[PDB]
Write a protein that binds this ligand. Structure first.
Ligand SMILES: *[B]([O])([O])[C]([C]C1=[C]C(C([O])=O)=[C][C]=[C]1)[N]C(=O)[C]([N])C1=[C][C]=[C][C]=[C]1
Ligand SMILES: [Ca+2]
Length: 263
């Protein structure tokens, strides 16, 4: 419950590796505070929000339909696919795949969606085309979690991710309906309980997306605020440590407690 930047630096002291952090005012885009804002970190599963941003952009362009049903085989399944592995017969709609990728971190869902847009290179092009010249996706799930330092593959920076997330959620890039659908999926996140959500007071809004590598790395991106409306964006990444998952979770939770206390 220290001052937030103090807590972030403390988390890095305890974990080893690097911790990156930024808080943006949602309305203005103003940077409120940051630590290692321009350094690269692996996105891990946080990329799944950007992926669904690209899918929605295609919907807005009349090139995709959220209701379109996709079928796949057992051979398409990769690890960490809790939703898709249950629909080998009936398949899933594009919208259902985005819900699964975002709310359950479903990897096969993400890969199927990557296929719809033309792969990691096209996600990167989508990002470049909306003004993010930093964030890059190079690999599919699960290889994108490899997190080699000093590998620039599959990385973002706290400020690039925060800025891009803000544009996807509030900008004129997506239609109002699509911006709302994206934040709705994030609001319905099911797997980030131990992170920022654990520090969230009653009545607050949060829409988020977490990510993990087996070893060394963790992250979360979020739009949150009091009184049922988001008012800030928070991005936290960690990488390059030997910290346990429990330790990584705890530090993010404590960073969350600090940023709430000192809101
Ligand atoms: B993702 O981080 O690219 C993916 C799926 C995953 C997400 C989350 C989360 O908090 O959203 C937690 C765990 C896994 N990561 C992986 O596929 C990675 N190989 C992995 C798998 C299991 C546990 C840790 C990392
Ligand atoms: Ca340090």
């Amino acid at each position: 419950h220290p001052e937030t930047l103090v807590k972030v630096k403390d988390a890095e002291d305890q974990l080893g590796g690097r911790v990156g952090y930024i808080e943006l005012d949602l309305a203005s885009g103003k940077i409120l505070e940051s630590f290692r804002p321009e350094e690269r970190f692996p996105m891990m599963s946080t990329f799944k929000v950007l992926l669904c941003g690209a899918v929605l952009s295609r919907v807005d362009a009349g090139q995709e339909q959220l209701g379109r049903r996709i079928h796949y085989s057992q051979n398409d399944l990769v690890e960490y696919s809790p939703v898709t592995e249950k629909h080998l017969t009936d398949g899933m709609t594009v919208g259902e795949l985005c819900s699964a990728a975002i709310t359950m971190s479903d990897n096969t869902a993400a890969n199927l969606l990557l296929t719809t847009i033309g792969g990691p290179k096209e996600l990167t092009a989508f990002l470049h085309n909306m003004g993010d010249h930093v964030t890059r996706l190079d690999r599919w799930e699960p290889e994108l979690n490899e997190a080699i330092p000093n590998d620039e593959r599959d990385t973002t920076t706290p400020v690039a991710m925060a800025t891009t997330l803000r544009k996807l959620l509030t900008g004129e890039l997506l239609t109002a309906a699509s911006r709302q659908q994206l934040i709705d999926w994030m609001e319905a996140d099911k797997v980030a309980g131990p992170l920022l959500r654990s520090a969230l007071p009653a009545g607050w809004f949060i829409a988020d997306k977490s990510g993990a590598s087996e070893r060394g790395s963790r992250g979360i991106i979020a739009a949150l605020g009091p009184d049922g409306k988001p008012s800030r964006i928070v991005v936290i990444y960690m990488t390059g440590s030997q910290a346990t998952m429990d330790e990584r979770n705890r530090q993010i939770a404590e960073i969350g407690a600090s940023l709430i206390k000192h809101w």
